[PDB]
Design a protein around this ligand. Structure first.
Ligand SMILES: Cn1cnc2c1c(=O)[nH]c(=O)n2C
Ligand code: FES
Ligand code: FES
Ligand code: FES
Ligand code: FES
Ligand code: FES
Ligand code: FES
Ligand SMILES: [Fe+3]
Ligand SMILES: [Fe+3]
Ligand SMILES: [Fe+3]
Ligand SMILES: [Fe+3]
Ligand SMILES: [Fe+3]
Ligand SMILES: [Fe+3]
Lengths: 334, 334, 333, 334, 334, 333
């Protein structure tokens, strides 16, 4: 728990906009979500997406069992009404008495982007941004948001599974494995603007990764001589110590085919990964795991996470430098 | 059964395009559907949506358990390949022998329109068209296709439920009932181009019905002084003697709000109707039902159905006249 | 199909009063019930229990999905209101217009007795009565109405199971079998007032009063003691293969727990249930082979056959077949 | 936790007499019950209801799987028989040998009252009594004992829910809320004989509460100029740290109507409360909850419970005074 | 329908001996079984397996709920005891009275062979025998009786599935399909002694079929220059018009490996067939099915079944000739 | 937690050979098993049954989701291949590079005997053996391995249930209770070769050879007859509250059905199961009260305590506590 405090400083996705709209017939929420083992409630009050602790200040009922009425979230028990800042503005039992100063619940940064709702629990370092999705606002690409998928595995283990190629022959022999490539070689990895950037050439094409730390991956798959750009954007919500809620958004230039051709293929790949990733134990990678040279991406990821954790302990400027300082291995200029 | 043969001459919806694409990972089908108690299979072969009897000519296996490979539907048992016309073009066991002339399955009219797949089982009268949806190709309106809903009631009983107002105070008191209107009066009903056309004024607005016989309803709800056009398009697939698969498509001019605000409200209305309509017995309306003057729409609907049934027995020209001749009660010019 | 028509002339229980009051939060019903494959609705309108066909005259919705509103049963669909005679008295869409003459639904005899609701589908012969329960109005006895139990067996087969002793050694060896009696003898059987009456004994007594066709009143008494126990069992013939069965029991010594008796009765029923449900075909064919020990069921089947034949001959023949006395015993009635 | 030790000194209901009689075919029990996380067994041994620890002294089998034999409880495993004092009186394997001195199990004060079975786990302070039910032995009233209901909420939170009126508009708008009363004013509350007493009302009627501390509530509802007395008696069994088994007994003077009219209504009320009360978290009310002036009853209840917990730590005399000393703020003469 | 009458003249398997022994704790049965829509009961009475109608002559209870007592089957209801001939020999209620002449139930020819129980419902033609299993009494072979498997398909369609090779590439591509063989050529088929005999093969091995009409298949798979004989014996019980209970027995010369290697493989093969065969409709093959030259085995099978059905209508002598007359088209000397 | 460490020194059954062969279509495994709360994987590599920790050294995936490939167990994730000693011998991503020294997983003793797979987690004291089953290699007897049965009870409580006669009247009144014996007397108990040996009788004999700590070999013989019946029951201590129990039975007269015996044994187990599962806390506390009839369990508990204490003293103390003879009877060994 002590181990995870630095993660409160990043933006994490908690639901799709669709999930929020489907939660209650109002289409405005509320929706209960859980992030880093914190119980939160999300709602649309007026034009704004709001995130609060899911716990009424009065008698601790869950506001996620309440009702959105315009610009208020009403508690289901004694009807206290909370505004967009988390402050109670109506105590129905005492409508003329002054509202206690303590009648407020914690309110957190909450923004929509790419069709997902993002929450940042701690904004005090003021140096993190919502992860980068390269296909946003590209009018050449059709964008599809998949339904979220829940895994009994941590966000770190999910991230390392997504960026590893070594497992293709064994987990994805008929779906992703390329017998003409088999073992892609180690590549240079750059840190830039709080992202890992690395590229694999096929060259006939390229797999270009832009990974916004700590849990988001933007993968651009391109081919020359063809206009066949495909973008996969994967991000894991660290729900608690053993669970992730995962979001996949994909974009494609050739969009005359069915969205479900791609959804079904992506779901097959995920079904192949799922039982093996969920089997990994203990849930957090212990020091006794044995790496080999082909594990470069995982090794460098673990190293940067540990540096962020240590920098968080030293405070805001140390964290901003650990996250945002460039570290270039490649021949590229950014 | 004898009673339902005339319905084979109309276009009936059997699935959404989404359902077809989701059926199999290929995104091309096949999908088993049932229409007028006939077992059919739908697939996308090349650019074309095809509908065939779901029964291989060889040993009667279901083609809906097979596989679409480009422009062929392959039977799952001995791999006979059927083309878009229902004709077997490959017998894998006898690849050099001539294919028997009998190695063909019945192929039916099948067209996509409005995001649904429509089938017409008998095209011999050559005088029916896919029902009219007024919001198609209107760029002012956002269109949403709901997931189909299955009811243990007939298409006729569903149609009469959708066009009746008398039940609002009792089934829809908090959703659709207007205590300021309560009992809308009987209105003139026109037959034109195989549609029932009738309008109710509110006037502050109007509910304008265009009902393509026998089972489709297009309802335009408009208000003057506001750009608040709403269109509801409801059509029932007569699956068998006691079941319907129902499709709702809705369009709206003011589209800044959530689609799920409307979906949830429409689902609530449907949940209020469902148990009462499913309770009606026997499933087909018998002669002993007692009508009152407020039942005009239902009475006139039943009369036109009976005329179509009788005209079908007399043949193509009689049916075309029964369906397409105008019969005007209103002051309108069409 | 036609061979059960004569059963429509009798009163049959369809539910407990408790089931009716629990069906809807108003405690007035309506409750859907099924009797001889007829779909019926029961409701309490004012002081009257009413039973109608569960089908509105307008568009055939089930009235059992509707609401009781004072002296009316209101259809859930378009709100037609039916009075206690099954006649529509309000068409909300046309409140001024005359109500069509056809706007009526069939209404059936419906009466509460003993805490059960009874329906008689055909009252034309005017000669049947609600079965006799001997403990009613006896202040010495505590009466308990058990929850109904459903069996995949006909009412005739259930009746013959209840009145047979031959099966105790094989079905009830630890519960009802008496190793020192084993084979109770054939006893005389009387027909009186539409009831079979017979008695099995100088210490005790098992006294049966069976109101034809499906009700059994069993009085168990012990001489030199005041320990009267009454069992009243009656089967509702729901359809051709199903019964809904009611058991009411009364006892003089009532300082013990009701549940001592309920648990024992439920154990006995659970022993009978799989064997009776296995009997096939559901209705006893003419090829069943009887022995002398089967006197009760032989006589039962003979009287039922007489009632079926008399029903075809009409009202007076049926009244005679049902109510004429036929006395085998020494007892005076 | 050890914060609960003081509750062991009170009488708590564990089952209805009906539940005991139904548990076993003999109608004498045994029945397993749980109270303050203790596993107990109840049985009728002769003319007495007896409560013992549900654990045989021999090899720790549950006596609740055993049988009542005469006036003793017989273990299911090797047949040891325990008397009403928890002492073993027969060891079937060694019938003539002396029974070990330690062959005994703890027993607890156990009494029937009002059709419930009550247990007091710690009788050493000897100053608590079974709670007061005002309708007992009043022949004008028909009494109905409802079946117990289980909630995932503590007895303290259940008590505060039962005595609060503030929540009616939000949880019970169609069942209990009175639009013409809305917010009853704060009333004086008296402590007398281990009970909270307070009354709500020219006044037409009265809501008169007698609350036997800590978890029992007797509510008399009367109407002046009418003879329609209604009594609700509600008491929660604290089963463990997060669970209650709850008993409702209701009495009414006007009794020609159906018991199930009232049972259905009470069940609807409970179904409305249940999800909101179960959502309150953490399960025990923390110090950070925010009260308003309308919460007087809850505030005073928590204050008295705190006093009882502190007095328990100082011993029998302090506890007796904290419980039984009167504190009057109304003008009622007692 | 009455099209099935002729099948009553053959021996059909109804259960394994294992199933009979497991049915009841005594290991003697009774076991209820169903054959050609007849409800029967099987029991071990003394040294004999006996089949009776599952219906007591007294009050029609199922004897399969009863018990074997000595060498008799005792009804569960009033304890009548039936001997191996179906005759009642004890009426417990009337132990000294004469037993009614009609106190008897129909019994049927019933024999154990190969670890299965076989029943012949109509023995009046007396010209059929229990099917041939070639591995019985061959000490070189280890025999395994699989658990029966139930399919929603007729015995005729199951037989044609078992003997067809055409479907391997499509139903069994990873299990049975041989890319280097693909389409075995048509072979001569012999009728001899009520069996179809045909062999598939310088040739390395052999697939040798002996098919005891109508539903049993003995397949010997051998490899020349090796001692790896494998035998598959498959027989379908026609339970009713749309259901089969199927028995597979397999024998192998090479037997150091695990039985479950083979059981797992056979189960996978059956799981591949099952959905396709169950989809065939209507359940009985109609005249409109289209055969090709590769279907010789199925064509000849249907032709012989038609001859047996027609000969049955002409009587015992015609049936015996249709079944047992030889028709040789190979050059094998028998 | 620490009080069960000494159990790691014994051989425990973890599965039948049948369960291993059915786990994967290859019939070679792998199969996940749990023993003393350790997660293990069992597989057949060549002619050897192997048991490893179910956790790859690379990224901690479960090897039980992998595949046997000849003489290797292959991890499902990145395909590392482990030999019979638990050492990785192929890293497919780096086929030329040297394999890290840390690329090994723990490997445990694993042996087939009697149709069960046995694992010994700690072989350091080198003095324990797979329990004795007397019917093995006896051509006169037919041997049947039952399917394992899982109970929510510890292996010690299961052992004491199996060897107690006192409970027959109360748990097994219709199956095992003999009304003409009722209370079998205390008998002498011998410790020999790490087994408890004791005999109950001049017509018959119940002869127990109990290999410590959890295995029971029971020979039931009848003098002047050739009807030897052997029951071999052994409990796998899966975790702190669960056992996976194996029953093997052998009989001389084997012309009857295996299922006559299986059904009877299953009936006896179903009678014990709810009572044994109710015992709480799961491990017997020191406050349990014994009587003289409890001699078998008293002596059992004493020997287990001696083994636990000796384990703390080390290898020679444990060997002595386990294998030293302690003879109470007249018999010669
Ligand atoms: C007590 N009890 C419970 N069920 C019954 C009896 C009985 O006494 N006779 C009897 O026939 N039946 C069916
Ligand atoms: S708990 Fe939220 S208003 Fe009281
Ligand atoms: S059944 Fe379709 S190819 Fe044979
Ligand atoms: S169906 Fe009953 S009022 Fe219309
Ligand atoms: S455990 Fe209770 S008598 Fe032995
Ligand atoms: S029904 Fe079989 S003995 Fe009576
Ligand atoms: S986790 Fe086993 S090879 Fe990587
Ligand atoms: Fe993967
Ligand atoms: Fe409606
Ligand atoms: Fe009985
Ligand atoms: Fe409430
Ligand atoms: Fe096959
Ligand atoms: Fe036992």
């Amino acid at each position: 728990n002590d181990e995870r405090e630095y993660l409160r400083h990043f933006w994490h996705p908690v639901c799709t906009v669709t999930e929020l709209e489907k939660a209650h017939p109002s289409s405005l929420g509320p929706l209960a979500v859980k992030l880093l083992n914190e119980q939160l409630v999300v709602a649309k009050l007026g034009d704004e997406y709001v995130a609060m602790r899911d716990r009424c200040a009065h008698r601790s009922a869950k506001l996620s069992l309440g009702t959105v009425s315009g610009n208020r979230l009403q508690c289901p028990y004694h009807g206290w009404q909370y505004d967009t800042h988390g402050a109670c503005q109506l105590v129905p039992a005492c409508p003329n008495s002054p509202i206690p100063n303590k009648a407020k619940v914690d309110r957190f940064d909450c923004e929509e982007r790419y069709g997902l709702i993002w929450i940042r629990l701690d904004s005090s370092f003021d140096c993190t941004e919502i992860p980068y999705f390269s296909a946003a606002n590209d009018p050449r690409l059709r964008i599809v948001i998949q339904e979220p998928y829940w895994w009994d595995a941590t966000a770190e283990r999910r991230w390392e599974n997504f960026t590893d190629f070594s497992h293709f022959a064994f987990i994805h022999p008929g779906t992703l494995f390329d017998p003409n490539n088999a073992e892609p070689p180690i590549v240079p990895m750059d840190r830039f603007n709080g992202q890992f950037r690395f590229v694999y050439d096929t060259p006939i094409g390229s797999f270009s990764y832009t990974c916004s730390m700590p849990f988001a991956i933007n993968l651009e798959v391109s081919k020359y001589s063809s206009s066949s750009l495909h973008v996969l954007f994967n991000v894991s919500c660290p729900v608690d110590s053993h669970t992730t809620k995962n979001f996949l958004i994909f974009a494609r230039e050739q969009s005359d085919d069915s969205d479900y051709l791609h959804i079904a293929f992506q779901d097959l790949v995920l079904a192949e990964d799922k039982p093996v990733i969920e089997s990994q134990w203990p849930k957090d990678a212990p020091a006794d795991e044995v790496s080999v040279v082909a594990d470069k991406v995982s090794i460098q990821y673990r190293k940067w996470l540990r540096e962020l954790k240590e920098a968080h302990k030293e405070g805001s400027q140390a964290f901003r430098s650990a996250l945002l300082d460039p570290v270039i291995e490649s021949d590229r200029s950014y």
